[PDB]
Design a protein around this ligand. Structure first.
Ligand SMILES: Cc1ncc(COP(=O)(O)O)c(CN[C@@H](CO)C(=O)O)c1O
Ligand SMILES: Cc1ncc(COP(=O)(O)O)c(CN[C@@H](CO)C(=O)O)c1O
Ligand SMILES: Cc1ncc(COP(=O)(O)O)c(CNCC(=O)O)c1O
Lengths: 452, 451, 452, 445
């Protein structure tokens, strides 16, 4: 009967999407985990695929009516293996996980018993919550509730994974699973050394490639599939797809375990219910694109842009964690500047520069992020080049100077006092912020943005 | 160059068109399925997908969340409004990725590993996420991480066995009792669940996934009058995007601050970045959920199911519990001389899509004794009571064809039935075609929502 | 060098031991778990066997110097088997458990994983703490901390194990281990029924015979070894041995498990260190006696004496749980007598009769036990026969009468109002308690007490 | 009928007399052994064994325990005085049946299942009860119900690597850190342990099983100055009966009432009836432990061990950590070119009883590269420093025989061959061994 378009069915939600669309258009989106997915992905995601229940696997379902859903799921699997240059007799893939966090949890449920041991990169050193996180007070991450996690750390003087200390701690702790891959690690991973450490204790070895999956597909970074047993990823970051997840696994037995059975059973019936076939349609689209020469070019540009930005930030005298980057991000250490990342993040956000505060090695308190994380994928997608990334670094720097100036004016010491002060109409640096914003937007609006 | 899907990926475009077709010309009777709206689809296929927004509105871990926050706030208040809830008494988290993670997040919030849980037994119409163990394996993640024990229907009445639940709860001492089901054809006695829960100091939760739209429109009783926590999928009877929600009391329950424990279990506990495109779609469906049209829809859903239920009875089918108060029937096929698996397959060949389902009394999990049939999806397309009677007839014809096919197969292993019916010399293909003709003739008289 | 005897080395301890010896002598010891062990047992226990570390098993020890400890432990093992008429090719035994509770915990450790499911007789219905016990509000026994226990119960009227209900709850609960055996149960156990119920869920089946081991060995009660997988026991109580434990196990695989290796490994290196070879010495000695015609005699006397007492109590109109007993104990339901076990136990204690207050099926309050448990083995060891046990029944009866009269004089229903009443100098029933005590000590002091 | 043991059971009588003769004539050098007194054996071999006393003094299940209560109370106040403890600040539970259950009761009292524990690694002289896992199995029950990770010695010094424990404790976040060990020749830096425990909010426990007598006599440092909980065996250094004790602060520790928790874990948590015969002997041994004579014996323990160590140095053996502060030495036998397993059997055949013990640096933990040797037992019998120098020579002689025995063999085949040409040298060693030992008294009944 009536089936209005959005602008008619819900004018308020329509208006919100248009405001977000305009914010994306005019901003420098520098969140390392964000990207702009294509019109074609969004169209697959916003289709009738959302209507189908298809619990199980292709050909192996608990409902009728899944002929076309099976075709899509098979295609998406083939494309996943193709994008990562994988032999299908050696590697399988499950494309049903709903996001990165549940793809990881499904792996643990597949190969680990409750309270089995896991090692991942420490959260304050650039790791991800889903690999484990405990404070003195509480088990924060669900992974640390259901499993026993102990982190490994960077060498704080170099910003590089302290592989020698991991060698020793692994031997004492006896993890059943060692996880490589990170949220805010600016260097490539020594997969061979992980393999040697994992073998020293008979551990399973996994790479979580959520941040760098597109770079790996394009052969810009080293291939984790040469060394690891299991690879997890999100589909929304460097891969530039819909919000979702994937798990890849060896098909030959690993420590006597059939990883394919274990992982497919953990995803379903273990942890999830019906697959989101709309998300799978978008994933298939992005995985086609991931095989193209343009994508390889794009990913090489991501790294070149991040290098141009890193080099300019160094020229503005910023300290980078690890001294630089091999990938799509940099982590800036703002302690020498004398300001935290939460204050910087806000000022920059007010000038249309969106990044995130990020902890830094050496931070005294997790409640106070000492740095900022900046990535090139999103703005690279829009067509910015090396020179424009140098300008981004200059605009970031203007914003930090403004952050420092605004800090000096605030009475109270809480972040909430800063936020109230800087958002107040009578904020004295309103002109400096509006001036910066105009420059930020003048750059951003020169470029196209993908999407519907 | 940012091509449309037809140009960017014609192979995926083609598959989507085939599925649009299949939906158009089939009778979709899966009780958990529905056809979501064009407006929901437009929201889900928007630029909201691009944003990382960990945390909660105005308490985020990233910059740039002004409009994302507006949306999530609007989504929450529409959630509460759609269920007629006072926001001083009830809170909501709209970020869960689906039904299964909503439920796992609640367990994570209020239980410790190995704590005791009771939920409706899987073969008596329950859900895996509420606990399932066979003799030799813990199948559900709920039964890996927690200690589960089911409760059951009374097989003579097809109604939940409240008297037995009262007794088993007393012995097992669950910390959490879960009401709600996937294939239960009646309303739930919330007052009796509350009494049983209080009898052991257990948390009490309702999983309203299948029935949330009927509860919203006040067609079934209100769980929120009695339980502590309500979970749901945003798909199914709510007719939204694929996602989930968790509602909770704000007054402390057995001393626990449920708002804090639940929000923290969702993030940072179990999930990362919220799916804001899904949250957009959810907001759209929650607006619609408050409309008089949606109320009309939900009453039609019940009337359509009852019309189908009666005609199956006229064809002498046994229904679990003798009928239905809601959107579904569970057909006990044992007295028709055939299992659900054989029937599901033949019906699917005829463009009638439903599912095989366990029936209480089944001597074996591996042979489902019934089929579950639902009205929401075809009701959304505009079918009425007479049309549901015709559906009942077509199912009957299909079950007759299934019996005839079973007669011709040596093994009566299932794989044998399948090979037989799928072979090109399958001798009943004309009967399946003839049925299929009648099925599509009906379905293709009706519009279907979406982009 | 001055290695004095106890009288000189430690006069205070010597004096305490002597006072205890005299208390034992002038008292009627009717606690059903108690006995008087022999002089020969006490000599082995108080020997230089205490000096040796012998971690491991015979011929497979971590230390040197164990030729003679080996001989002893090998001999203890073959006497344990022989006393229970066990074929060594079907049954093995570990004689190192430090007591009854460590014996049971070693079995759990052997055959279960943490949080596995166990069913045992409910503590308020006469089971033991070590088989599982939880209040609404806490996990009291170690077994309920480390494992998931659910009790089964007696029938409220018959006094008997409600086998039918156990059939149904084990079906639902799916325990991995079912434990038969009780601390305060007056009937023999239907072992064939426990086997059927066990098999219906694939559970291991265990008997804890601590209270009845002597009766089983003398073939007075039915043989659990015909039907169960594992039997545990204390070496004290019914066996009249030193304070220790043993575990017996099938040597054929049970549900795919090698119990011998599992159980032995659990005991050592799992849970215990150096065996207490002095105690194994005393155990060997009691097991020789356990095979003797005099022990078989004594055990039939234990049952006859308990029946004599029971019958005389029924003449005095007392109600017995299950209307009687097939074993060494009787459980008196005092609810129809109008008084509880705690008031009765206390009066009886004031008159040198030691028994214990006991919960009865139906009791409203765990704080107010409705009964008393009475046992014959200790006094039967001293040489009492049936006519003496009939006299014991009359002495108890007089104590109940005194207890009733004391209750009627105290206005409180508060138990400490009762205690204050009975302990006051002006306590009106002082001469009645003195009179009863005279008769009690007059009976008791006619019989010897074994020991050094 | 109630015969004596020689009449009741001649075969057990005969075995006990053989074991008595073996103890009398041998050099008993197992570091964990001692010879307890006639007075302890008499208390342990008493009517005390008959009584059920579930609970605590005045707080029992059953009646008839007036004398059992008096006994336990006295035992507790002797335990506090033997270790110079203020009873307002410290309590003790004297019911644990041995060292292993004492420890497990502490874990049960203060930890939840799967909570984290760190103790000295087993191949580095630790104890099973503190945790032990291999690649393929959780060997200790401690490692099944709880999550253990070890800490290690610095292999170049033979001392605990406190810097490494500092770092690994920060990563692993143990809820309990355990100090104390079965084969560690040095005193412990309790102040450092406290510092490390505090860095992660952990409970800190000392297991003083091997060194309690030395601590009571003030020969080694006092753990009670720094730790929350002290467990011990009562055999070993303290020279008592076979049992355990747990000491605890009575001031709240990280908001835990340790007294209530530990008492409840012992009973009703894990054990039943106390072994009052054993508490009797313990009480006797704790009176002796307060005396001037005990203090002299413990100083003699340390002097004797130093005499042996220094003679084994003259004979050019390597000692793990370069000596000892205590009652034991750990000899590194790899530079002598033979393992501890072969040496142990040959020494035992000549009536020298010690044990094979791993060395920091073993390649396979199937092959111990060393031996542990202790002075407590022979010190109790009256031996001085000259005799421990003679013991050192006798061990030396037996090692030379073990090498020559290994030379005549070409791998448990060593045990086929010895059980023989070298019988004469084994027997000649034995004669001198037994000639030294039988010159001294032995305590006991
Ligand atoms: C290595 C890794 N693995 C898994 C995930 C989880 O993905 P999800 O947010 O889709 O659950 C992330 C997300 N990472 C987000 C969270 O900060 C980011 O902005 O970096 C990740 O970095
Ligand atoms: C520190 C510590 N804690 C606990 C125990 C266990 O005491 P138990 O054997 O009485 O259980 C020991 C015994 N240790 C034995 C093990 O070989 C020994 O010979 O040293 C111990 O050394
Ligand atoms: C009661 C109930 N709860 C939770 C879920 C899980 O929803 P997800 O599949 O999105 O995780 C379901 C799905 N049940 C599937 C069906 O009835 O067909 C359900 O029926």
């Amino acid at each position: 009967f009536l089936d209005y378009g959005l602008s008619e069915a819900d004018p308020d939600v329509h208006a919100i999407i248009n405001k977000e669309k305009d914010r994306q258009f005019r901003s420098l989106e520098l969140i390392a985990s964000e990207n702009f997915t294509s019109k074609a992905v969004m169209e697959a995601v916003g289709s009738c695929l959302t209507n189908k229940y298809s619990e199980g696997l292709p050909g192996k379902r608990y409902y009728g009516g899944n002929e076309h859903i099976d075709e899509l799921e098979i295609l998406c699997q083939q494309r996943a293996l193709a994008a990562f240059h994988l032999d299908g007799d050696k590697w399988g893939v499950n494309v049903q996980p709903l996001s990165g966090s549940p793809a990881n949890f499904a792996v643990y449920t597949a190969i680990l018993k409750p309270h089995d041991r896991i090692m991942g990169l420490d959260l304050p050193h650039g790791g991800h919550l889903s690999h484990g996180f405990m404070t003195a007070k509480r088990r924060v991450s669900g992974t640390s509730i259901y499993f026993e996690s102990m982190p490994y750390r960077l060498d704080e003087s170099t910003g590089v994974i302290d592989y020698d200390m991991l060698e020793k701690t692994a031997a004492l702790f006896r993890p059943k699973l060692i996880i490589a891959g990170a949220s805010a690690y600016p260097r490539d991973i020594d997969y061979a050394r992980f393999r040697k450490i994992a073998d020293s204790v008979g551990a399973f070895l996994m790479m979580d490639m959520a941040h760098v999956s597109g770079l790996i597909a394009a052969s810009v970074l080293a291939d984790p599939f040469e060394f690891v047993d299991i690879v997890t990823t999100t589909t929304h970051k460097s891969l530039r797809g819909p919000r979702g997840g994937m798990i890849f696994f060896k098909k030959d037995a690993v420590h006597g375990v059939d990883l394919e059975s274990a992982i497919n059973n953990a995803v379903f019936p273990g942890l999830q219910g019906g697959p989101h076939n709309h998300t799978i349609g978008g994933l298939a689209v992005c995985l086609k694109y991931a095989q193209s020469p343009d994508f390889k070019n794009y990913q090489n540009q991501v790294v070149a842009n991040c290098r141009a930005l890193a080099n300019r930030l160094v020229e503005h005298e910023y300290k980078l964690v690890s001294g630089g980057s091999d990938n799509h991000l940099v982590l800036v250490d703002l302690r020498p500047s004398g300001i935290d990342g939460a204050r910087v993040e806000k000022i920059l956000d007010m000038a249309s520069i969106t990044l995130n505060k990020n902890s830094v090695p050496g931070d005294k308190s997790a409640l106070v992020p000492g740095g900022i994380r900046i990535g090139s994928p999103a703005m690279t997608t829009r067509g910015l080049g090396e020179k424009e990334f140098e300008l981004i670094a200059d605009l970031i720097h203007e914003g930090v100077r403004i952050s420092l100036e605004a800090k000096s004016l605030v009475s109270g010491t809480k972040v909430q006092d800063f936020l109230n002060f800087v958002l107040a109409p009578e904020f004295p640096l309103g002109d400096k912020v509006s001036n910066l914003r105009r420059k930020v937007e003048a750059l951003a609006t020169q470029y196209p943005i993908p999407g519907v």
